[PDB]
Structure 1
Amino acid sequence: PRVIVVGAGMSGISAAKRLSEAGITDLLILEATDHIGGRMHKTNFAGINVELGANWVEGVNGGKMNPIWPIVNSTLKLRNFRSDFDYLAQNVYKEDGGVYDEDYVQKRIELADSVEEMGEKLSATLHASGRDDMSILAMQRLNEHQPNGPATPVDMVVDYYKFDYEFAEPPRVTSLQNTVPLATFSDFGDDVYFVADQRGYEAVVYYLAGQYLKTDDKSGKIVDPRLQLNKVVREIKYSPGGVTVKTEDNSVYSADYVMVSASLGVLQSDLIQFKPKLPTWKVRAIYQFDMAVYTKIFLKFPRKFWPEGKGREFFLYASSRRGYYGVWQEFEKQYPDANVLLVTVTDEESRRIEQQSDEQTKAEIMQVLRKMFPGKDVPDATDILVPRWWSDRFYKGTFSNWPVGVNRYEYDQLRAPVGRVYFTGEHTSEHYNGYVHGAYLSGIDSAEILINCAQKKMCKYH
């Protein structure tokens, strides 16, 4: 059987790998960009390679092994470090300078954490159909007994840190049942490790690809003609007998099946035309799920003016404006002496920020930093990097988020195949949507459904 796989990010490469393993080697992987890896991609910033996209292996040291971990930490030995968030309470800055008292902050953190745990108990009891789901916010109101969730500067940045910084959308839009607790942490462990290696977290993808695609002996570049880069799929025609795939440069290919791995945001943008049009139930499922945006703004300074040392890696800015330049990370271990800082924003702020100049964003950030470190001579950043994932047509966002309103059956419709057209990607992982490991596993899972149809003639889905 010939199979065309659209996209060579983690899930596509992973799916193709599994097909190869089942003996399906008549493959053609069509990648839009000039490289593989997709949302795992590094870039040179001020002389160092930093990650524009995925940066952590999340879910480590628990009851089961996250499949990505051994590759990162053993097979490839990518340089990495465990993130420690235990000292946040000593690092929350006031809108107007200096940090809050540690004991005061630790108490708000403990309250927030208690509400969430009460939320995990409620969640376990909700009907599996998702019909009784509610937003994380409704659960917070219930447990704090207030007509609102966190609303003062400190509680709000603590809330953002706890939720938006992981999901990239506010608790009020997010499904309680599908995110509290989160299987990634429950199954694989509570720790996370930040990859900081010149080769990039994407090395994991190049490694998998190399297990089955041909590579150059001296350069080690993949040279297999089954992988074709710079091929943007613009149309997929499918019928009872097979499928035809057309790219922007006018190439046309045929196969028995096609596996689509493009992000949920690409699917929501109509970059790819399906003929016939996808069924209404499928379309509705595609539009109801959320494609979030998480913007890693890197900044480079001529000298350092922030604290370094124990518990200093992560710090928060308690703005009275929720989510305004709130979560900071300093790189004393990852990029020593580079004088770089990383502030993360998401959702509304990301969209605003992608739409204006980097210079304007840099000036907003400098006012924040000067308010946070009033006693220092804070020098203007000499370089800034604002990743624009929502604006990139091959991504249209950074990762999916399960909103309140999408139920279990609707989520399955999102993953379901349509005739000979199969879907894969992080947004198709039932328990790990959003993550690199969810992309990896979704590729194997989709490939298997295809293998059953193709090899065992078991073609019915659910």
Structure 2
Amino acid sequence: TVGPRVIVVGAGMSGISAAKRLSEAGITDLLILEATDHIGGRMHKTNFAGINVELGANWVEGVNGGKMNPIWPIVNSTLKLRNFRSDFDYLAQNVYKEDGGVYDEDYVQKRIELADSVEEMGEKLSATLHASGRDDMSILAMQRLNEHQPNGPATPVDMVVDYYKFDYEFAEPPRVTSLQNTVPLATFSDFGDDVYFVADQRGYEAVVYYLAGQYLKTDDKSGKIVDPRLQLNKVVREIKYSPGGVTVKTEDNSVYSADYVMVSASLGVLQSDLIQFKPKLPTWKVRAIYQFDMAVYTMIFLKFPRKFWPEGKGREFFLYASSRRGYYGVWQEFEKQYPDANVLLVTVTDEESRRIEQQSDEQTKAEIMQVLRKMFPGKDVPDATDILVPRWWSDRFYKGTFSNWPVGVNRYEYDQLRAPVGRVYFTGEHTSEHYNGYVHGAYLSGIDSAEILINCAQKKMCKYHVQ
């Protein structure tokens, strides 16, 4: 409250996580400017039907492994948020033919096993690659290498399996994704292979609220944060930085002065025009910004008069093996999570997301009915009473859902993304050293970025040397 002053742009998970570590170090003169009317960012729940569902992150990915994922204790022990281990063991039983009903289990299981071992091969190769990524490649090239082919999985089952294995995780096709940096994934190698599905009407966002309440003044009766240092509905539009200090202009024309600015807005937002930098950021930094990927991952939710889809063991995850790659193939049913709610989840990513976001909710529900009517020619399938189409790409405060490591981005130029310019510091999942794309990554980037700065402010070490 006296000493250097840091303005933190954004009250998402990395924004909150940074400001906490800052407060703890003694840097308590904090101003958090949050663009929307709530903290938590891409951890955001919403009312669908009569339930609360997640628009953003829904999983704690990487549990049960060699090292404790820091998100996990908070979820499972502290807040005891309702959640379920995901079981993908049965997918072979649950892949639907484009016209009429399920494939032969034994058949699918083979293609699965075959996919798995190509990826096991690519794991081995990845570990041999030079650390400069002089000799990195796309996941797809590794697939071609192994499958001895001009192309990757190119037939309806093979693709939806490919999609499940990759797109469903990184929101972009294997052919744009760097092998060296996704195969294998530090989230899973480090924290475990398991993923847990948070279904707790408090919201996964509860994790961020909780960390916020560690250091921000909250009302004793109500619980709401009331700390003057948190400023909602504050859209940062300009950042002026000289060696003297920094100016932050918001959209209602407020100008704040600080010693240092911590910027936690998504790589998507950074890629847009929303925040103008004066001076323009160095060419190196701009190049790093535009070369990395901000993927879109859309969780279409559906309400039904009755159920028509199998429930029971292995019935949560099913795929639709469309002849058109990435066309309503990934489906989730919620017998455990919201029983008996009668809702389905289809996921889409990337090119389909951008199409679907731009098109009428109506039109979309059309396309989905058609697919569902194809998948269960047997049953008598009612129209969905309600659809939900999260439009994160469209939203100017997000412009996507999480980062993806593309081919051609190496370790050096990844680091340039996170490297500070002057008194301008960056945090956010996209700056995470080993966990870009993830809640825990965003959380841990909070701490790291905070520490880079604490080192400058207190210990007077301010030249950050990129590697």
TM-score norm. by structure 1 comes to: 1.00
CA distance in 2, matches of 1:152, 1:343: 21
* Sequence identity percentage: 100
Deviation at 1:274, TM superposition (A): 0.5
Deviation at 1:286, TM superposition (A): 0.2
Deviation at 1:284, TM superposition (A): 0.6
Deviation at 1:379, TM superposition (A): 0.3
1:238-289 alpha-carbon deviations (Å, 9 max, x no partner): 1111001010011111110000000000000020000011011110110000
Deviation at 1:94, TM superposition (A): 0.2
Instruction: Give the one of 149, 169, 174 matched to 1:171.
Output: 174
1:316-351 alpha-carbon deviations (Å, 9 max, x no partner): 000000000010000000010110000000000000
Deviation at 1:118, TM superposition (A): 0.6
TM-score norm. by structure 2 comes to: 0.99
Deviation at 1:130, TM superposition (A): 1.4
Deviation at 1:18, TM superposition (A): 0.2
Matched, 1:52 2:55: yes
1:119-159 alpha-carbon deviations (Å, 9 max, x no partner): 01110111111121100000001111111110110000000
1:76-103 alpha-carbon deviations (Å, 9 max, x no partner): 0000000000000000000001100100
Deviation at 1:430, TM superposition (A): 1.5
Deviation at 1:445, TM superposition (A): 0.1
CA distance in 2, matches of 1:28, 1:108: 53
1:29-69 alpha-carbon deviations (Å, 9 max, x no partner): 00000000000000001111100000000000000000000
1:143-201 alpha-carbon deviations (Å, 9 max, x no partner): 11111110110000000000000000000000000000000000000000000010000
Instruction: Give the one of 220, 226, 238 matched to 1:235.
Output: 238
CA distance in 2, matches of 1:21, 1:323: 46
| SS in structure 1 of the partner of residue 151 of structure 2 | coil
| SS in structure 2 of the partner of residue 140 of structure 1 | helix
Structure 2: tracts of 5 or more residues without a match? none
CA distance in 2, matches of 1:279, 1:156: 41
Deviation at 1:419, TM superposition (A): 0.2
CA distance in 2, matches of 1:381, 1:31: 35
CA distance in 2, matches of 1:218, 1:111: 58
Instruction: Give the one of 172, 190, 193 matched to 2:193.
Output: 190
CA distance in 2, matches of 1:406, 1:301: 44
Of residues 290-299 and 129-138 in structure 1, the stretch that sits farther from structure 2 once superposed is 129-138
| SS in structure 1 of the partner of residue 188 of structure 2 | helix
Deviation at 1:408, TM superposition (A): 1.2
Counterpart for residue 380 of structure 2: 377
| SS in structure 2 of the partner of residue 173 of structure 1 | coil
Deviation at 1:407, TM superposition (A): 1.1
1:303-323 alpha-carbon deviations (Å, 9 max, x no partner): 000000000000000000000
Aligned residues: 462
CA distance in 2, matches of 1:146, 1:280: 39
| SS in structure 2 of the partner of residue 214 of structure 1 | coil
Deviation at 1:460, TM superposition (A): 1.1
| SS in structure 2 of the partner of residue 311 of structure 1 | coil
CA distance in 2, matches of 1:90, 1:353: 29
Deviation at 1:456, TM superposition (A): 0.3
Q: Which portions of structure 1, spanning 4 or more consecutive aligned residues, are displaced by more than 6 angstroms?
A: none
CA distance in 2, matches of 1:447, 1:337: 44
CA distance in 2, matches of 1:257, 1:339: 49
CA distance in 1, matches of 2:239, 2:70: 32
Mapping of residues 5-44 of structure 1, within 5 Å? 5-44=8-47
Structure 1: tracts of 5 or more residues without a match? none
Counterpart for residue 312 of structure 2: 309
1:364-420 alpha-carbon deviations (Å, 9 max, x no partner): 000000000001110000100000000000000000000001111110111110000
CA distance in 2, matches of 1:25, 1:56: 32
CA distance in 2, matches of 1:252, 1:335: 46
Matched, 1:277 2:316: no
| SS in structure 2 of the partner of residue 306 of structure 1 | coil
| SS in structure 2 of the partner of residue 410 of structure 1 | helix
CA distance in 1, matches of 2:129, 2:422: 33
Of residues 73-82 and 125-134 in structure 1, the stretch that sits farther from structure 2 once superposed is 125-134
CA RMSD of aligned residues (A): 0.5
| SS in structure 2 of the partner of residue 151 of structure 1 | coil
Instruction: Give the one of 2, 6, 9 matched to 1:3.
Output: 6
CA distance in 2, matches of 1:89, 1:429: 34
| SS in structure 1 of the partner of residue 166 of structure 2 | helix
Of residues 408-417 and 6-15 in structure 1, the stretch that sits farther from structure 2 once superposed is 408-417
| SS in structure 1 of the partner of residue 298 of structure 2 | strand
| SS in structure 1 of the partner of residue 387 of structure 2 | strand
CA distance in 1, matches of 2:387, 2:100: 23
